[PDB]
Amino acid sequence: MVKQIESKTAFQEALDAAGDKLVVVDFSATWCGPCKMIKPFFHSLSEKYSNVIFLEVDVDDAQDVASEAEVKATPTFQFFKKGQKVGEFSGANKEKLEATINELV
Template identity: 40%
Template sequence: MRTTRRSTMDTITITKDNFQTEVLKTKGTVLIDFWASWCGPCRMLSPIVDQVAEEHPDVKVGKINVDEEPELASQFDVMSIPMLVVFKDGQKVNESIGLVPKEKIVELIQ
């Protein structure tokens, strides 16, 4: 499933079923946004993550709803959301917890 955005880039909905293919087997950079619909800071961060996705087409951007994917949230020790995790060539290389400005997200994916 993909969420629709205004641009031609899509943010991928990541689930336990597609995590291996979309994240671990991807060559290059993947930014994952762990979020929940009831989380105010998550709702504020989401459009910023979408902007980063639009401005960095070389980075795959995925979103994981922690309520729908508790196994993935547990696997990455998600205790607070929003939480951003960066993978490069299938390896976790960076993370950020809480509402952060766009500049910080860009730094994370560099």
């Protein structure tokens, strides 16, 4: 499914429960409108790819984790694995997520 990150504490334990499988992340903005209409797409992958771990960070409630990756352009997606960043990109191209997932699949 998905997991809402409230701070960096849950972010670390999240990568711990992931183990070694892929772990994508979704940095959106609730206070924002357009950067919010793209959540039914990312969260939809949760049930389409039960073999992948999807997270959900809020640059307003979890601004602590957003400052780590320095996200200055939402929405943004990051590819983490074994707790190591291996890929990432920013852009409201929800369709790109498909070709991207087949990148580090």
